[PDB]
Design a protein around this ligand. Sequence first.
Ligand code: 9M1
Lengths: 230, 11
Amino acid sequence: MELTPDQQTLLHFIMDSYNKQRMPQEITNKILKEAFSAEENFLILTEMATNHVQVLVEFTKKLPGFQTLDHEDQIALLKGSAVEAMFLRSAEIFNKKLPSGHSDLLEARIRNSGISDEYITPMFSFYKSIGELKMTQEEYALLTAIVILSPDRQYIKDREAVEKLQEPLLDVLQKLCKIHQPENPQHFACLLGRLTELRTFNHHHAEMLMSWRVNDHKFTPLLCEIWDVQ
Amino acid sequence: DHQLLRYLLDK
Ligand SMILES: CCOC(=O)[C@H]1CN(C(=O)c2ccc(F)c(F)c2)CC(C)(C)c2c1[nH]c1ccccc21
């Protein structure tokens, strides 16, 4: 029912690693500052994503038992989760309460940043759906760790070794859902269900990036490696 | 090869 000393220790350690990310305000203040062109926005978002991947690798390395895993599986786990983790983080940032009309202005700037409407509509639908769950920072952090440590990922040699690392994190999250939301016994199921929804953003990701209304699609070498672009 | 990702993982 309640968190054991080891579970409390695990949660606090995951939270410290997760808090090393760029602050939601640091991302929202840049966008909400001035009205930027599609060429400027693509450059702003490319830098944001490069930083996201950089901090994600550091967070991933800190996950208990990740260093003990086979080198090939480590790469496949990061490459297979990077996009999902970026959309989970983007959802956390968008749903952060801001002053009156600020979240609506942020939505407007992203919708008019150069991206095709075909990819925007399911993206803001997912952000608004995630928001409805009223997730805490601990749930966002644990859900990110669960996403990264998904054994049912492509090209993984030893699934069982990944299962053993994900299992305590699922147990911690399950306990937290029963604590923060005892009114809704389906809350944990909703979170896990949102992981399947996250997987849909993978297949057409490179397509969304190349269909951006910019003459030239420049990416950093790290993004090219993680997103399989250029 | 994912040499940049492998480097960031080793260090
Ligand atoms: C945490 C790191 O997030 C990113 O870097 C995103 C963020 N994305 C957001 O919608 C977003 C951004 C800022 C907010 F404050 C917010 F609430 C949401 C999604 C997307 C538009 C699809 C994108 C990102 N980087 C790109 C690079 C090239 C092309 C497209 C993107």
